[PDB]
Design an enzyme around this catalytic site. Sequence first.
Site, PDB file in Angstrom:
ATOM      1  N   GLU A 162      -7.757 -11.020  -8.730  1.00 35.59           N
ATOM      2  CA  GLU A 162      -6.886  -9.867  -8.457  1.00 35.59           C
ATOM      3  C   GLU A 162      -5.663  -9.808  -9.393  1.00 35.59           C
ATOM      4  O   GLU A 162      -5.291  -8.724  -9.856  1.00 35.59           O
ATOM      5  CB  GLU A 162      -6.454  -9.860  -6.981  1.00 35.59           C
ATOM      6  CG  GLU A 162      -7.604  -9.613  -6.008  1.00 35.59           C
ATOM      7  CD  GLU A 162      -7.288  -9.955  -4.557  1.00 35.59           C
ATOM      8  OE1 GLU A 162      -8.241 -10.019  -3.751  1.00 35.59           O
ATOM      9  OE2 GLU A 162      -6.109 -10.161  -4.201  1.00 35.59           O
TER      10      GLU A 162
ATOM     11  N   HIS B 259      -1.439  -5.638   1.241  1.00 33.48           N
ATOM     12  CA  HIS B 259      -2.587  -6.507   0.952  1.00 33.48           C
ATOM     13  C   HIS B 259      -2.099  -7.855   0.430  1.00 33.48           C
ATOM     14  O   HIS B 259      -1.141  -7.907  -0.338  1.00 33.48           O
ATOM     15  CB  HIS B 259      -3.526  -5.883  -0.098  1.00 33.48           C
ATOM     16  CG  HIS B 259      -4.475  -6.869  -0.715  1.00 33.48           C
ATOM     17  ND1 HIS B 259      -5.698  -7.177  -0.157  1.00 33.48           N
ATOM     18  CD2 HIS B 259      -4.357  -7.654  -1.813  1.00 33.48           C
ATOM     19  CE1 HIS B 259      -6.301  -8.092  -0.899  1.00 33.48           C
ATOM     20  NE2 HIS B 259      -5.503  -8.403  -1.904  1.00 33.48           N
TER      21      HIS B 259
ATOM     22  N   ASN C  71      -2.345  -0.065   7.112  1.00 30.40           N
ATOM     23  CA  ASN C  71      -1.772  -1.403   7.362  1.00 30.40           C
ATOM     24  C   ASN C  71      -0.862  -1.950   6.228  1.00 30.40           C
ATOM     25  O   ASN C  71      -0.788  -3.164   6.009  1.00 30.40           O
ATOM     26  CB  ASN C  71      -2.884  -2.397   7.736  1.00 30.40           C
ATOM     27  CG  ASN C  71      -3.806  -2.721   6.577  1.00 30.40           C
ATOM     28  OD1 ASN C  71      -3.891  -1.966   5.609  1.00 30.40           O
ATOM     29  ND2 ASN C  71      -4.509  -3.845   6.676  1.00 30.40           N
TER      30      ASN C  71
ATOM     31  N   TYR D 164     -11.609  -4.050  -4.147  1.00 24.14           N
ATOM     32  CA  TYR D 164     -12.248  -4.118  -2.821  1.00 24.14           C
ATOM     33  C   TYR D 164     -13.790  -4.180  -2.902  1.00 24.14           C
ATOM     34  O   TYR D 164     -14.483  -3.632  -2.039  1.00 24.14           O
ATOM     35  CB  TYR D 164     -11.799  -2.923  -1.952  1.00 24.14           C
ATOM     36  CG  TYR D 164     -10.327  -2.919  -1.577  1.00 24.14           C
ATOM     37  CD1 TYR D 164      -9.769  -3.972  -0.848  1.00 24.14           C
ATOM     38  CD2 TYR D 164      -9.497  -1.849  -1.924  1.00 24.14           C
ATOM     39  CE1 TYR D 164      -8.426  -3.971  -0.498  1.00 24.14           C
ATOM     40  CE2 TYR D 164      -8.152  -1.840  -1.574  1.00 24.14           C
ATOM     41  CZ  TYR D 164      -7.624  -2.900  -0.860  1.00 24.14           C
ATOM     42  OH  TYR D 164      -6.293  -2.897  -0.521  1.00 24.14           O
TER      43      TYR D 164
ATOM     44  N   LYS E 291       0.821  -1.210   0.000  1.00 27.76           N
ATOM     45  CA  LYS E 291       0.000   0.000   0.000  1.00 27.76           C
ATOM     46  C   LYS E 291       0.859   1.267   0.000  1.00 27.76           C
ATOM     47  O   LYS E 291       2.074   1.196   0.198  1.00 27.76           O
ATOM     48  CB  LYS E 291      -1.010  -0.010   1.157  1.00 27.76           C
ATOM     49  CG  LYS E 291      -1.398  -1.355   1.747  1.00 27.76           C
ATOM     50  CD  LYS E 291      -2.747  -1.868   1.292  1.00 27.76           C
ATOM     51  CE  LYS E 291      -3.654  -2.276   2.446  1.00 27.76           C
ATOM     52  NZ  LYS E 291      -4.799  -3.086   1.958  1.00 27.76           N
TER      53      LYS E 291
HETATM   54  S1  A7Z Z   1      -5.862  -3.919   2.808  1.00 23.90           S
HETATM   55  O1  A7Z Z   1      -6.197  -5.086   2.074  1.00 23.90           O
HETATM   56  O2  A7Z Z   1      -5.408  -3.999   4.151  1.00 23.90           O
HETATM   57  O3  A7Z Z   1      -7.181  -3.002   2.714  1.00 23.90           O
HETATM   58  C1  A7Z Z   1      -7.975  -2.759   3.869  1.00 23.90           C
HETATM   59  C2  A7Z Z   1      -9.242  -3.309   3.956  1.00 23.90           C
HETATM   60  C3  A7Z Z   1     -10.008  -3.093   5.089  1.00 23.90           C
HETATM   61  C4  A7Z Z   1      -9.514  -2.337   6.152  1.00 23.90           C
HETATM   62  C5  A7Z Z   1     -10.288  -2.210   7.406  1.00 23.90           C
HETATM   63  C6  A7Z Z   1     -10.774  -1.115   8.109  1.00 23.90           C
HETATM   64  C7  A7Z Z   1     -10.561   0.340   7.935  1.00 23.90           C
HETATM   65  C8  A7Z Z   1     -10.687   1.197   9.034  1.00 23.90           C
HETATM   66  C9  A7Z Z   1     -10.400   2.547   8.911  1.00 23.90           C
HETATM   67  C10 A7Z Z   1      -9.975   3.069   7.702  1.00 23.90           C
HETATM   68  C11 A7Z Z   1      -9.850   2.214   6.609  1.00 23.90           C
HETATM   69  O4  A7Z Z   1      -9.343   2.679   5.419  1.00 23.90           O
HETATM   70  C12 A7Z Z   1      -8.997   4.060   5.295  1.00 23.90           C
HETATM   71  C13 A7Z Z   1     -10.167   0.867   6.708  1.00 23.90           C
HETATM   72  N1  A7Z Z   1     -11.521  -1.567   9.190  1.00 23.90           N
HETATM   73  C14 A7Z Z   1     -11.463  -2.872   9.143  1.00 23.90           C
HETATM   74  N2  A7Z Z   1     -10.726  -3.334   8.108  1.00 23.90           N
HETATM   75  C15 A7Z Z   1     -10.384  -4.741   7.859  1.00 23.90           C
HETATM   76  C16 A7Z Z   1     -11.443  -5.466   7.149  1.00 23.90           C
HETATM   77  C17 A7Z Z   1     -12.270  -6.082   6.579  1.00 23.90           C
HETATM   78  C18 A7Z Z   1      -8.250  -1.767   6.036  1.00 23.90           C
HETATM   79  C19 A7Z Z   1      -7.480  -1.977   4.905  1.00 23.90           C
END
Ligand code: A7Z
Lengths: 149, 150, 149, 149, 150, 149
Positions: free
Chosen positions: E127, E116, E113, E50, E10
């Site tokens: 994907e 991916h 995080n 997504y 990312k």
């Molecule tokens: S990646 O594949 O890690 O993409 C990703 C998917 C889902 C999340 C996420 C979030 C979250 C919270 C706050 C802000 C976000 O993006 C700006 C995303 N909350 C839970 N999840 C996991 C799931 C399902 C992050 C990253």
Amino acid sequence: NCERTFIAIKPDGVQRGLVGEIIKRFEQKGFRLVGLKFMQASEDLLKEHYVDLKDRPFFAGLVKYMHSGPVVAMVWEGLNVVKTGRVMLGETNPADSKPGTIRGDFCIQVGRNIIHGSDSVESAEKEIGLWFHPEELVDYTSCAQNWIY
Amino acid sequence: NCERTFIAIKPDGVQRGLVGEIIKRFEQKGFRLVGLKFMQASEDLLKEHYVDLKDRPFFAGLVKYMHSGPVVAMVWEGLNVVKTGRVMLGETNPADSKPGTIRGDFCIQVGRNIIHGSDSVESAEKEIGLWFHPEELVDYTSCAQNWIYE
Amino acid sequence: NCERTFIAIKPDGVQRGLVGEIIKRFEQKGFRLVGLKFMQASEDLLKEHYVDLKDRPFFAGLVKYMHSGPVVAMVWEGLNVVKTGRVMLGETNPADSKPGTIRGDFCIQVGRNIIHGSDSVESAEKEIGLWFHPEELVDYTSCAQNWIY
Amino acid sequence: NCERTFIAIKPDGVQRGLVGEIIKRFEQKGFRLVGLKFMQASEDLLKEHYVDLKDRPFFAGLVKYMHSGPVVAMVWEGLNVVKTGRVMLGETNPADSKPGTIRGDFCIQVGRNIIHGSDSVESAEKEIGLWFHPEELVDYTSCAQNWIY
Amino acid sequence: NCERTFIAIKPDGVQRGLVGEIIKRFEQKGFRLVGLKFMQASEDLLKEHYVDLKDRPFFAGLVKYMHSGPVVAMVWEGLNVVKTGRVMLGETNPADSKPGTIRGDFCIQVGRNIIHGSDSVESAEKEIGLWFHPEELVDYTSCAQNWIYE
Amino acid sequence: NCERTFIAIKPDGVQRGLVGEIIKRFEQKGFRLVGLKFMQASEDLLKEHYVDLKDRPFFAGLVKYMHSGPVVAMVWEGLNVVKTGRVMLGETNPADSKPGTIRGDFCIQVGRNIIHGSDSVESAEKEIGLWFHPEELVDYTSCAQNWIY
Ligand SMILES: *S(=O)(=O)Oc1ccc(-c2c(-c3cccc(OC)c3)ncn2CC#C)cc1
Ligand SMILES: *S(=O)(=O)Oc1ccc(-c2c(-c3cccc(OC)c3)ncn2CC#C)cc1
Ligand SMILES: *S(=O)(=O)Oc1ccc(-c2c(-c3cccc(OC)c3)ncn2CC#C)cc1
Ligand SMILES: *S(=O)(=O)Oc1ccc(-c2c(-c3cccc(OC)c3)ncn2CC#C)cc1
Ligand SMILES: *S(=O)(=O)Oc1ccc(-c2c(-c3cccc(OC)c3)ncn2CC#C)cc1
Ligand SMILES: *S(=O)(=O)Oc1ccc(-c2c(-c3cccc(OC)c3)ncn2CC#C)cc1
């Protein structure tokens, strides 16, 4: 053999996450950590520390850069720690610094060169006295001392 | 191209925990591990090994230091492994050794300089024969040989 | 506390350049290197070593794989070195091995799983006796012993 | 300060598992990744790229070696990235390369020397244009830019 | 052994200087690099990628975050590369991620995080097809293949 | 996510050369270094710090061990830094600690377990106040903050 040098990790060094990486190099080399502290340096401290550079064109910007964030101030002990410490840091200008050295591995421009080391035993004792109270410098024996000397 | 050098991690090197770190450098460089053993060297072995230094003021203390703990004796193979191995070790005095080299990165005083390498092909073959029986030197082909040598 | 385990870097581990990397993990953990040697193992040695797996479908192929190249045989000393050593290696199948463990970090298939460790104190003493003469096991005191125990 | 260089990890570099290790050195140094792609280079591309070496005794074997597997083509940005990039790579012959440099740390023979870097700003712009479409070169600001310059 | 997964570093991962560090972990593990490219992803690409998270409260902010800088898109090959790749990444929330894993070692908040990985073989093939043209996926044999797989 | 936690590198950790290695893990994780100092702790400080363990069989020996050499006292900031910091340290007994964790990677016996972390936000604020004057805790913004949160 009980020689001491003052090493300062500049604000860019702290900001870019090189504190552990830099400390690791002095540890694995064999030198003994004597003093260590994390502080935002005042301009009066920096002006005294860089007093030989007082009337240089960059001096104002140097003092600003060094005041801008916190620094890790350190004191390391060992045989020719001042000279060898300088070698490990590499040339003051990172353009001249060799791969393997701290500046050579981790930075590009002279204005943001991540670390300071004392140039001599004379400067070391002045800089140590300037940055540390004597009570903050810890005395102990390394368990590996007989295998280092 | 299958030239061989002798490398010995001294007792201080073993005591300070640099065996893996040192071996890693020869591996990632591309050289092939031929021999490896962990032994306390006798004084007769050390005196023969350092025979060119017999009548030097430090020689007694050198032999004592090297007898004091165990050493990792090694044999590495490859193109100019003796010369390049020496370069990787850095200068015998760590004061002169450059950052990036084993001694430059990991030690301070000449009396406790963590590692030995053969100075020449002549010395290498003498030191290999001295420290290893021929049965202990393993022959095999590196799977990365065609990507290390042409 | 003076307990010992037998660790063996398999031929794939040697071929892929993990000898230093593996040894480094035992060193930095705090365990003491007692024995170390580099040898091509005979089939009679391997068959005795893996005798509990004698009548398994893979046993023939295991013995061939282990004979195919040289191995780094080792002996390490310390408190619960057998149990903790096993933990550091990770699960025998790398599919189950956790990141942070040797197999978890460095290999994929169970048939090429880079390293062996003794499963118990009983197996350790049998495997040590099997792979090493007693004269090859070096006795010394770590300079860091008082800071490890 | 916005200067670019072209860096290619040769097939042996990819095969021996040094892609991450090499990229890491440019990242931790402070340079900005601008372009990155993984491709098997055609002989016409390689012949144009190494055109200054066209009538050398090794040129046929060079083109073959470079065609034999895939390469990681890259573009990095920063102050004196061409010159400093060359220094980080070390001497073209690994026999001359110093410990601390990529070739010095990771390879032995000149014929299998793991990495290419542009020798000058002129060569850099030619090689970048040759290996990348302009659409593939990404423009962005490093969050650590004010601490690098 | 011919299974493939889609890994993507990312924008925060690129910005914080973890590209080499992340790639290194897949290399040293034994997996084969099949595809690799550096691109700013369009919102239509990210929304399709997504799509299972389309009607989640964070989805708008996710798409924005992922559009904000460039990503390193990758394809890795090997036995159970999808499942094992997921394990190496650690839990999607870094709060749950174990030390030793990429997220566990290198990041803090779920919204930033760093990486991916594909959750399944089905998702992986979707994907891969989505992020790469088939001409960009390179086929070759690892010189260490006989020491990684029987 | 402006939580702070107190982390201390015990005397064995300093003696064995893990200061840089430990600091590196917090840096690369994303947490912000707030305070850092190198001091020999007095017994009154240690007795107050470990007051919940006052009437345990090891408490005398704990206080002695912790007084025996210097420690690196630290304060780190970030989202769930107390909980996540504890996870990174691993279990207090290294026998239970997982590979990947600081104790899991670097130590063996519970009596020489190299590092302390605060168990809760309550304990953290008590321990920070105990080990640091407020003037020693530096406030600044990480340049990577928008990419960490
Ligand atoms: S990646 O594949 O890690 O993409 C990703 C998917 C889902 C999340 C996420 C979030 C979250 C919270 C706050 C802000 C976000 O993006 C700006 C995303 N909350 C839970 N999840 C996991 C799931 C399902 C992050 C990253
Ligand atoms: S550190 O101890 O190296 O501190 C330091 C001292 C001197 C220099 C410097 C500069 C320079 C150029 C541009 C901007 C600067 O600060 C913002 C400083 N030019 C030459 N020198 C070396 C000398 C003497 C940099 C850093
Ligand atoms: S290693 O193979 O380098 O072994 C070794 C050989 C020679 C020296 C040495 C010394 C020296 C100084 C003080 C104490 C010593 O031993 C206790 C040795 N002085 C010069 N040399 C290099 C030569 C010739 C050290 C180590
Ligand atoms: S080592 O100690 O890891 O030695 C070892 C023992 C047993 C196995 C194994 C196998 C297996 C599968 C395919 C091919 C093999 O050898 C060529 C071996 N299947 C299950 N186990 C685990 C057990 C017991 C591998 C390696
Ligand atoms: S890369 O850019 O390092 O590519 C490359 C260019 C030139 C050389 C080379 C060779 C040589 C020797 C043997 C085999 C070769 O290729 C198979 C190439 N001899 C001298 N140089 C450098 C010059 C001029 C190697 C690699
Ligand atoms: S640190 O915070 O890890 O300090 C610390 C506290 C308590 C222990 C400990 C001990 C123990 C055993 C032997 C010797 C000791 O000190 C010299 C301490 N037994 C259980 N615990 C776990 C707890 C709490 C170690 C270190």
